[PDB]
RNA sequence: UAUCAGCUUGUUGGUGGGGUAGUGGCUUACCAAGGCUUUGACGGGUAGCCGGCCUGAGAGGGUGACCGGCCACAUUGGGAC
RNA sequence: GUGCGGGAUGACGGCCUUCGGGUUGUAAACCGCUUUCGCCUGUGACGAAGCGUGAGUGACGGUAAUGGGUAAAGAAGCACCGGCUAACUACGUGCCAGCAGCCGCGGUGAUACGUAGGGUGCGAGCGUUGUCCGGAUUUAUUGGGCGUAAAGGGCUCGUAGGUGGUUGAUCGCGUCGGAAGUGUAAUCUUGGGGCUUAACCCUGAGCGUGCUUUCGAUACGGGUUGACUUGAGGAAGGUAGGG
RNA sequence: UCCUGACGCUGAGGAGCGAAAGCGUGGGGAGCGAACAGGCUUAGAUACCCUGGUAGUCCACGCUGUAAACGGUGGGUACU
RNA sequence: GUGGGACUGGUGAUUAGGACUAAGUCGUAACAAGGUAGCCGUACCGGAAGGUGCGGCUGGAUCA
RNA sequence: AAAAUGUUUU
C-alpha cells in the first residue's frame, strides 16, 4: 500500500489465539472431578486413553487427561489441571498434575519421575 | 556447583586430552561408554558444542559461570574469543596452574579455595578471583611447605611459564607482567566456534 | 585435503514407473579454498557417494573468485536467484559466520569468517545456496571500483576498510614469513 | 502525470545503462543539471550537456554521455531515489546514509547546494536524501 | 484455479439457498 | 470500537452583578444562537500515567512488580468545618 | 563446596556379547595429601569525625572477619538419549499398556512405551505449566504482496484528502547548522573505586533519541507573487464508426 | 498555424450507469421455452432424448444491482 | 420512592445448520469428452446428490 | 445410445 494508505489505515497485527481459556491466566487451577472415564482416540491411533471432566474452580468444566500407567482417582476427587494438549484426542486440551491433590504419582515410574510425581525410592 | 567426577571419561568423549598426558588417554580415538566405537556425524551444533565443552572441561568453568564469561567478551571490543580466553586465562586458578605451582587446574582450584594463597597482599580463596595486571601473587606464609608445593617446586623447571608470568618458584610469587594474548594461551580449542555457538 | 567442501544437503527424489518408483538422490556440495574461489555443485546419481562425487566434480569448474577485504566481505549485498533471498554483510573481526546452515556452509567454503547472512524469502537449500552464490558474485572489489569510476582507491572508499586491508595483508605477510 | 522529474532521471540512466545506451536525454532542471554534474565528477558518467532547444524549441534539454569500460562493463552498478514525493527523507550531519558500505554515493541536497555525503559529512551539514548512486 | 474451490463454494450457497426457500415463511413472520 | 452518527440548552458567546487566593458559565440576571463531529463528536469496552522492565540487529512489540515522580482513593454515597 | 595428586593388576559386581571379550573405569580398592563451607572452640569489629554538660552511648550482635580442632568426612540431584537436538543398547510389552512440541511411535527384532546398563545436557538445582517477545519479512516505515497461489472495487463520474511541468523574486513554516535552557535521582552504556571475587554498591562521563528560546543557511518541500508552454483544456478545419 | 497558461493526476465516503434472470402495473405473444403433462431409456430416471407446453423471452414505465460483470491484470505518466 | 425506555449476561420446550466419528443406508454429481463439457449469476423443480431454462466464461473440446 | 458401485488388515 502507498504510504497515504498507510496514513489512513495502519497495519494490524493478528488475534494471537489462546489455547487454554478454561485456565483464566493461571499455570494450573484446582478442580473436582465430575466425571471419570475412558476415550477412544482419533485414527491412526487406537487405545483407552483415561480422562476426565473436571469442574475447575474458574467454573468452567473441561476434559484433563491421566498421563501414566496407574489410576486412582475418581467421582469427586480433588485434583490439580495444568495445560498441555493430546494431539490425538479432540476436544482434550487440558492435563491432570500427578502427585498433586487426591491424584498420586504412578507407582512403578523410575525414570521421568518428576513428570508424574512419583518420590524417589531409597 | 563443582565437576568431581572423572575428568578422562569427558577427555575421551571430547577426543582431545583436558589435562594430563601418557594415561589411560591411551583410548583416546573414542568416548566413553558401551558405544564408543561407531562411526559419527558431528553436525555444526555438535562440532561447536564439542570446543565449548572443551574450554568448559578444561578450565573448570561451569555452564552460567562461561555464560556470564561470553556476554563479558562479546560487550568488550575486539576479538570475542580472544578476549574469552583471556578472561578464562585471568581466573586465578589457571594463573596458578600456568606459574606452575600446581599439577593440574583441579589441584589449583583445591590450594586457592583452601586459601593457601595471597593476591598482593590480601587473602583470596575464591577461584574465580579475575587476576588484573602488575598482580603479585604469594603463597600464604603457613602453607609454604605443602607436599603439592614442594612437588610443582620440584617439577617446574620443565614445565614452560608464559611469557606473560614470572615465577620465582622457591618463594612462591607469581608477578603479572601483563594479561595475556591469544598468542599467548595455547591453542587447544575453538573460540570462534565458541563464539558462533553462543549466537544461534 | 587441498579444497574443503560441505554436504549442504541430500534428497531422496523418485520417478514413478509401472512397477513402481525409482527412487534417486541429489546431493548439494559447496567446494572453496578457503581463501576466496569458492563453487557449488548438483549431483544426481542412484547413490549417495555417486551423488556427491559428481556435485564436488561439476563444482570444481564452477570456482568463482570473492572479495574478502581482510576476512570479511567487501561491503553489504542483497542476492536472489528463484526465490531463495539472502542478505550479507561485512562484520567486524571475531564476529564469526553468523549464518544460516546453506549459506554457512557456502561462507565457510569460500573463506569468509566475519559475516551477517540472513536468509529471507524460502528455504529450501538450493534456491538459498544459489542466492548465496549470486550475493557473493555481486560482491565489487574496491580497485575495481575505483576503475569503474575512474577514481582512485583512496578517493572513493572508506579510509577504515583500506586500513584494515593493510593490516590483514601485514597478518598475512606474518603467516607466510612463519611457515 | 509525471511527478517526480528527479525519479524519471534516475529511471532514464538506470535504463539506458542496462540498455547499454551511449547517451540518453531528457527535459532539463537546474536540479537535474546539478545531479548530472556531481555525477560526473564522482565518475558515474562520462560526461554530460546541456542544449538549448532546437528541435522542439520549447525548453532546454539534458544530455547524460555514459561510460563503459573495457569489455563493455557497466561504470553505474545501480542508482535509487530516496525522498520521494509520497515519502520525503531528510538526513542531519550525523546521520548522514552509506551506500554499498561507502564505496557508492548517497546524493544529498543541503542548504549549501548538491553535494555527495562524504562532501556534507566534510561540512557537518545535512539535508534531503535525493539519490543513493553507486 | 482447480475448479474444486469453486465446487464447495458452489455446494455452500445452494445448502444456504435451499435453508432459506425452506425457512422462508418463517423468517418473514418473525425476523428477516 | 462505526455491527456507536449525530452530541450539547449554562450548552457556545456577550453585558451587569455576585463569588473566589485566583482567571473563568465558577455563579447569576438579561441578550444573542451558538459550540462539537466521518481528520470520528456522543456512546460502548478496557486501563491509573511515567522514569523504567522484558524482548529485539534495529525499527518495533509486550509491560507499568521492587525503586523514583505525578495522580486518584481511604466501609459506600454526599457534605462542609 | 561436596575433595586433590598418584594408582592396571585395567580387580570384583552389574550390563552387553560374535562367549573372544567389551563396558562401567583410574572409576574402585589401595597410597599420599589439603581443610574452603558445615560442626567444635577462641579472638572480635566498622558503621559514631554521631549523640550526651557529663557519666556514658550499636538494635543488628559474640554478627562479619579471623586463629585453633575434627574427619575425605556432614554435603547431588533433575531432565533427556527417532529427527529438529548433545547423547543407545538389552529386557518386558504386543495398536494393549502407553508416549508426543510437530513429524509421528506401539499390529512381535520398539534406539520413540516400561525398566536396566551406558550415555548427554545442566547442576543446588532440574523439569513441567502459564504468560510475553524472538524466530514470523506471518501487518513488511526499516521490510511483503494482489494474471493463475489469499488479494484489482462490475464501470465511471466526482467531494474531502494525497500528490504536482519549467522558471524569476521573496518569506524562512518543513528541512539543515550553532548557542542557551531543560530532559531529577535510580536504571542503562562506559571510565575509575569499594565489598576476599562476583552479584551488588559508590563515583565521573555519556545517554536522556525530545521540547522551548535564540542566532544563522536557502538546495529541496510548502506559502506569497510574476512569468513560460511542453502537460491539460479550448477554437478552426479535416474525419472514422453495430456509441 | 490559433487561444488560455499547470487550469494536471488520482480519488475514501457519496452518486450514477450496470448482461441475463427476477419483481410490480398495463400491453403483446409468432418462435423458443423453466415449471408441467405424456412417451421412451433405466434396477429407478423427480434426467439426458421425443411429443406437448405456462410463466418468461417482446413493449411501456418503474424496481432489483448481481455475473467466470475476466485480460481472473485499477487509473495516470516517463523510459527500455 | 414511582414510572417508561436503552444496553446486556444466563437460561429456554421446540427448532436450524456446522464440525467430527461405524469400517451404516441411498444413489454417482464432479475429476477422462467422467460418459449430457464444466463453472458463474439468477429462476423454478426434485429423497439427495442434482435437473432444466436465460445470459455469461474457458479455468472445455471437436473440426480447422 | 444409455450402461452404477469397490468398508476396518497389520
Ligand atoms: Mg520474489
Ligand atoms: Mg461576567
Ligand atoms: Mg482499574
Ligand atoms: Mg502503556
Ligand atoms: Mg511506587
Ligand atoms: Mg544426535
Ligand atoms: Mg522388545
Ligand atoms: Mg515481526
Ligand atoms: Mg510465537
Ligand atoms: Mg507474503
Ligand atoms: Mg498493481
Ligand atoms: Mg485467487
Ligand atoms: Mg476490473
Ligand atoms: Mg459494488
Ligand atoms: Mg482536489
Ligand atoms: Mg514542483
Ligand atoms: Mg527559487
Ligand atoms: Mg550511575
Ligand atoms: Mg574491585
Ligand atoms: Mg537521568
Ligand atoms: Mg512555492
Ligand atoms: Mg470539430
Ligand atoms: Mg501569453
Ligand atoms: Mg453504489
Ligand atoms: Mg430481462
Ligand atoms: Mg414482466
Ligand atoms: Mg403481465
Ligand atoms: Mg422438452
Ligand atoms: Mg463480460
Ligand atoms: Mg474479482
Ligand atoms: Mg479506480
Ligand atoms: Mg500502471
Ligand atoms: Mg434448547
Ligand atoms: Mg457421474
Ligand atoms: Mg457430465
Ligand atoms: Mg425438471
Redesign the pocket.
Known amino acids: 500500500?502507498?504510504?497515504?494508505?498507510?496514513?489512513?489505515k495502519?497495519?494490524?497485527?493478528?488475534i494471537?489465539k489462546?489455547?487454554?481459556?478454561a485456565?483464566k491466566?493461571?499455570?494450573?487451577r484446582r478442580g473436582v472431578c465430575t466425571r471419570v472415564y475412558?476415550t477412544?482416540?482419533?485414527?491412526?491411533?487406537?487405545?483407552?486413553?483415561?480422562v476426565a471432566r473436571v469442574r475447575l474452580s474458574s467454573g468452567i468444566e473441561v476434559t484433563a487427561?491421566?498421563?501414566?500407567?496407574?489410576?486412582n482417582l475418581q467421582e469427586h476427587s480433588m485434583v490439580l489441571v495444568?495445560?498441555?494438549?493430546?494431539?490425538?484426542?479432540?476436544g482434550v486440551?487440558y492435563?491432570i498434575?500427578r502427585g498433586s491433590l487426591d491424584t498420586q504419582g504412578?507407582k512403578?515410574?523410575?525414570?521421568?519421575?518428576?513428570?508424574?510425581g512419583?518420590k524417589?525410592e531409597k | 556447583?563443582?565437576?568431581?567426577?572423572?575428568?578422562?571419561?569427558?577427555?575421551?568423549?571430547?577426543g582431545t586430552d583436558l589435562?594430563?598426558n601418557?594415561?589411560?588417554?591411551?583410548?583416546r580415538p573414542?568416548?566413553?561408554?558401551?558405544?564408543?566405537?561407531?562411526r559419527?556425524?558431528?553436525?555444526?551444533?555438535?562440532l561447536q558444542?564439542?570446543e565449548?565443552?572443551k574450554a568448559?572441561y578444561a578450565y573448570g568453568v561451569?555452564?552460567?559461570?562461561?555464560?556470564?564469561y561470553y556476554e563479558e567478551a562479546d560487550?568488550?571490543?575486539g576479538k570475542t574469543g580472544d578476549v574469552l580466553l583471556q578472561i578464562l586465562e585471568s581466573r586465578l586458578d589457571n594463573v596458578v596452574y600456568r606459574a606452575g605451582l600446581?599439577?593440574?587446574?583441579?589441584?589449583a582450584?583445591?590450594?586457592?579455595?583452601?586459601?593457601?594463597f595471597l593476591?598482593n597482599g590480601?587473602?583470596?580463596?575464591?577461584?574465580?578471583?579475575?587476576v588484573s595486571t602488575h598482580d603479585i601473587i604469594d603463597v600464604r606464609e603457613?602453607?609454604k611447605?605443602?607436599?603439592?608445593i614442594v612437588?610443582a617446586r620440584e617439577t617446574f623447571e620443565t614445565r614452560d611459564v608464559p611469557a606473560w608470568l614470572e615465577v620465582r618458584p622457591n618463594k612462591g610469587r607469581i608477578l603479572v607482567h601483563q594479561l595475556p594474548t591469544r598468542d599467548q594461551i595455547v591453542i587447544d580449542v575453538n573460540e570462534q566456534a565458541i563464539v558462533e555457538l553462543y549466537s544461534? | 585435503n587441498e579444497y574443503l567442501e560441505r554436504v549442504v544437503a541430500i534428497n531422496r527424489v523418485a520417478k514413478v514407473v509401472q512397477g513402481g518408483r525409482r527412487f534417486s538422490f541429489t546431493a548439494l556440495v559447496v567446494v572453496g579454498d578457503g581463501e576466496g574461489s569458492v563453487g557449488v555443485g548438483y549431483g544426481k546419481a542412484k547413490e549417495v557417494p555417486a551423488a556427491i562425487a559428481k556435485a564436488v566434480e561439476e563444482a570444481k569448474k564452477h570456482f568463482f573468485k570473492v572479495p574478502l577485504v581482510g576476512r570479511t566481505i567487501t561491503h553489504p549485498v542483497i542476492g536472489e536467484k528463484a526465490?531463495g533471498?539472502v542478505?550479507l554483510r561485512p562484520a567486524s573481526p571475531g564476529t564469526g559466520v553468523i549464518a544460516g546452515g546453506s549459506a554457512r556452509a557456502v561462507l565457510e567454503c569460500a573463506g569468509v569468517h566475519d559475516v551477517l547472512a540472513?536468509?529471507?524469502?524460502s528455504?529450501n537449500a538450493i534456491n538459498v545456496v544459489h542466492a548465496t552464490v549470486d550475493a557473493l558474485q555481486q560482491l565489487e572489489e574496491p580497485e575495481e571500483v575505483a576503475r569503474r569510476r575512474g577514481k582512485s582507491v583512496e578517493d572513493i572508499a572508506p579510509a577504515a576498510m583500506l586500513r584494515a586491508r593493510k593490516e590483514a595483508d601485514e597478518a598475512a605477510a606474518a603467516a607466510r614469513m612463519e611457515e | 502525470?509525471?511527478?517526480?522529474?528527479?525519479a524519471?532521471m534516475l529511471?532514464?540512466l538506470?535504463?539506458?545503462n542496462?540498455?547499454y545506451?551511449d547517451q540518453?536525454s531528457?527535459?532539463?532542471?537546474?536540479?537535474?543539471?546539478?545531479i548530472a554534474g556531481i555525477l560526473k565528477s564522482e565518475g558515474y558518467i562520462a560526461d554530460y550537456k546541456v542544449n538549448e532547444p532546437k528541435e522542439?524549441?520549447?525548453?532546454?534539454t539534458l544530455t547524460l554521455t555514459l561510460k563503459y569500460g573495457e569489455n563493455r562493463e557497466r561504470s553505474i552498478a545501480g542508482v535509487r531515489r530516496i525522498?520521494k514525493?509520497?515519502?520525503?527523507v531528510?538526513?542531519?550531519?550525523?546521520?548522514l546514509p552509506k551506500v554499498l558500505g561507502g564505496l557508492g554515493i548517497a546524493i544529498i541536497?543541503?542548504?549549501?547546494?548538491?553535494l555527495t555525503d562524504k562532501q556534507a559529512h566534510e561540512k557537518?551539514?545535512?539535508?534531503?536524501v535525493?539519490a543513493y548512486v553507486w | 484455479?482447480?475448479?474444486?474451490?469453486?465446487?464447495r463454494?458452489?455446494?455452500?450457497?445452494?445448502?444456504?439457498?435451499?435453508?432459506l426457500?425452506?425457512?422462508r415463511i418463517?423468517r418473514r413472520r418473525a425476523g428477516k
Open positions: 500500500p502507498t504510504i497515504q494508505q498507510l496514513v489512513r495502519g497495519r494490524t497485527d493478528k494471537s489462546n489455547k487454554t481459556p485456565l491466566g493461571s499455570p494450573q475412558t477412544t482416540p482419533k485414527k491412526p491411533n487406537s487405545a483407552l486413553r483415561k487427561y491421566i498421563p501414566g500407567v496407574g489410576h495444568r495445560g498441555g494438549r493430546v494431539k490425538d484426542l479432540p486440551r492435563k498434575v504412578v512403578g515410574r523410575k525414570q521421568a519421575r518428576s513428570r508424574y512419583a524417589k | 556447583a563443582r565437576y568431581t567426577g572423572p575428568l578422562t571419561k569427558k577427555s575421551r568423549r571430547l589435562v594430563g601418557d594415561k589411560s588417554f591411551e583410548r573414542y568416548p566413553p561408554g558401551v558405544h564408543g566405537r561407531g559419527t556425524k558431528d553436525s555444526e551444533y555438535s558444542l564439542r565449548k565443552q568448559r561451569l555452564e552460567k559461570q562461561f555464560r556470564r560487550r568488550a571490543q600446581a599439577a593440574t587446574r583441579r589441584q582450584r583445591q590450594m586457592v579455595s583452601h586459601g593457601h593476591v590480601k587473602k583470596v580463596n575464591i577461584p574465580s578471583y579475575r603457613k602453607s611447605d605443602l607436599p603439592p612437588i544461534k | 526465490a533471498v542478505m540472513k536468509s529471507l524469502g528455504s | 502525470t509525471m511527478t517526480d522529474p528527479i524519471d529511471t532514464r538506470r535504463n539506458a542496462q540498455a545506451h540518453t531528457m527535459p532539463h532542471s537546474k536540479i537535474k543539471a546539478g522542439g524549441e520549447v525548453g532546454k525522498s514525493p509520497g515519502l520525503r531528510y538526513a542531519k550531519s550525523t546521520a541536497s543541503t542548504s549549501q547546494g548538491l557537518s551539514v545535512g539535508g534531503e535525493l | 484455479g482447480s475448479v474444486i474451490k469453486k465446487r463454494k458452489r455446494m455452500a450457497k445452494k445448502k444456504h439457498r435451499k435453508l426457500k425452506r425457512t418463517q
